[PDB]
Write a protein that binds this ligand. Structure first.
Ligand SMILES: N[C@@H](CCCC[NH3+])C(=O)O
Lengths: 388, 402
């Protein structure tokens, strides 16, 4: 059987997909009795140079040339983008074409509507390559952005300011000139949306993820956390309780003994809680060749071509920084004991001149508003995780 | 239009019982969903007079494996018996008789999986052994793992609570982690089996159990741990496979791990596999071992997979990725010497004079007239060399994460 495919996009991932198919073509014929023909490649601009170099494939700038080709069996999309890309994929599925996508901009809303449209039209939608950082899961926590983690590691290990650490990340290639997507936690929040969809089968919106970036984390925060037994990481978290997902991305104190506390520099990790023990997956972000390899894997799966469950038969902790405090640390601790609702434990630390930090274990919600209404100036509050 | 899938179970221990319960509890669902009716037609047991729960008495129990192997109505054989002989021959026969085989046999090694996988492909049927391995998975060049929960638990206890090996092992016994004869754990045999398996899955190479150079943890002392600690290292029992120049070098032994390495943080009964490759970053998988219900659940999962693809990937197939063209190691040692006269400065100076070229050397007090050295960047163990220069070498552990 000839399997006629088209590629939408030819960047590093697209080029990699092509090379992998070329290199394995004879093997795929001999083994699976399938002949993969790349009949069209959509590119934005036919003139640009590429890792493929000058090649033998038909390049087009007109997507309709691909979407109207009824001889196509499978569309491989490596273009990125939501518009017009998602509409292209909707058309392909409506035309009874299998779709494999490595589109990093897709969110849960998009994957859901594409998965349904695929099922509806009797074809496959594969998005394995779209994720890169895969059992009743109740909670996950992750370090999901390499650049922000790199910055925090640098601040921590080398005792530099955020500004110095970000400049170093810029010169080393990790951060871009406008590093907002990394530093403000947007990239991490996207991965929290995707991870929540995969873990809980629930669709949340990007703006449902309560998000704070790292630009306000200081050495003082890091060193106070250190003395209390914690590192600071930008943590993306999803908690699935009572039919609802609470999702967030924010600077978080993590107990030094926690597996996540050791994840440094540009490495990422996803820590999954469920019943069973915890599990964790650790590694850097893929990986053009890895992404390309995952696409081709999904491709062979579809070429070799529903669900899933089976037989059954928590408080929060907080790091609070308060400024303009008159009086001693002992007095502050006593006042805090008097003000707080019932909780499990409290420790206080010096933070700066007339500033103290408290870690409070076992509250239902942030004591920020409460402490504010009692007349204190709260600088900020970070969650605390890994507490045993 | 419902198709009956006739299966047999070889063995009915905790895993076998769990497999049965899971199938029972999900039977209606598997019919309604996949339009498949799973019928457990035979269960092989060692002793069929033995009293069993009521649910088991509904099934046909036999002590004669041939009754199962000769039953042409069987579609799938699920083996949860364990053992190499006669168990592997049973599975060979099943495959030759065109029966799919799902196994959770914990005694299977690479030699066995290889011959069964080939025999399966050869006969147009599936061999599934997912349940035979505990989770936590292209060009992998090296892996390092903490592969035995009990030994890791013991080392964590020694380290955190400052106990001797003997005290930590007794505690592991009392707490349920170690068994009464803990040899398989403590001597690193279990870990060596997993290194054979991990090497087969990572490198597609078959090694024998006796090719794995093995040392357990029973000789690790609190002094080793505390001296390692002061030098910046933890001690773990590490199972390692290095694939260099067509050959696998495989080992299990006490190993100093830099405290900043991801493996250093893996404590208690948790396991982890750390995987290194060209040209991607390192990866690691972390979690505890199975798990009778988990093993049983994995068997049933493999079962449904074989059911779904029943009416329809060759083991020989590997995706070539030498378009890495288009897109684009030394050893370290911890050496303990005893009966050393003279100062630590003198020991360090002598080592500097006698060692071949290396990246760094640090020395520490170990005990009375005993010193330890960590040496980074040698081509091979300096043990013989140090011995011929008149030092009593107590032992040498590899050092990783440097
Ligand atoms: N305390 C023992 C530990 C055994 C190490 C064996 N390699 C000794 O003196 O060697």
């Amino acid at each position: 059987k000839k399997l006629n495919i088209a590629l939408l996009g030819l960047g590093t991932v697209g080029s990699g997909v092509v090379k992998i198919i070329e290199e394995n073509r004879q093997q795929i014929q001999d083994t699976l009795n399938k002949d993969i023909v790349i009949k069209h490649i959509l590119v934005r601009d036919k003139s640009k140079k590429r890792p493929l170099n000058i090649s033998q494939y038909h390049l087009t700038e007109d997507v309709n040339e691909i979407l109207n080709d009824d001889s196509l069996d499978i569309i491989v999309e490596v273009m990125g983008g939501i518009e017009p890309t998602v509409d292209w994929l909707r058309t392909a599925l409506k035309n009874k074409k299998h779709v494999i996508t490595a589109n990093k901009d897709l969110l849960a809303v998009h994957l859901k509507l594409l998965e349904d449209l695929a099922e509806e039209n009797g074809v496959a939608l594969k998005f394995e390559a779209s994720v890169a950082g895969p059992n009743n899961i109740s909670k996950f926590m992750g370090i999901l952005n390499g650049t922000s983690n790199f910055i925090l590691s640098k601040m921590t290990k080398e005792q530099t300011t955020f500004e110095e650490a970000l400049d170093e990340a810029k010169r080393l290639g990790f951060a871009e000139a406008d590093p907002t997507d990394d530093v403000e936690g947007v990239d991490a929040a996207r991965k929290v949306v995707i991870t929540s969809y995969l873990s809980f089968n629930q669709v949340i919106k990007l703006n449902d993820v309560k998000r704070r970036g790292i630009s306000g984390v200081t050495l003082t925060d890091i060193n106070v956390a250190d003395q209390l037994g914690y590192k600071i990481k930008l943590i993306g978290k999803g908690i699935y309780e009572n039919g609802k997902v609470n999702a967030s991305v924010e600077p978080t104190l993590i107990d030094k003994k926690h597996q996540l506390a050791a994840v440094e520099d540009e490495y990422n990790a996803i820590y999954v809680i469920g019943a069973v023990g915890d599990t964790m997956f650790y590694g850097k972000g893929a990986g053009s060749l890895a992404t390309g390899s995952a696409v081709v894997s999904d491709l062979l799966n579809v070429a070799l071509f529903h669900t899933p469950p089976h037989f059954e038969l928590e408080k929060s902790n907080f790091f609070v920084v308060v400024n303009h405090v008159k009086g001693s640390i002992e007095n502050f601790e006593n006042e805090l004991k008097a003000i707080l609702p019932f909780h499990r434990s409290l420790r206080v630390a010096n933070y700066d001149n007339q500033s103290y930090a408290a870690v409070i274990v076992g509250l239902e919600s942030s004591p920020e508003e409460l402490i504010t209404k009692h007349g204190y100036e709260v600088d900020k509050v970070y969650p605390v995780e890994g507490v045993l």
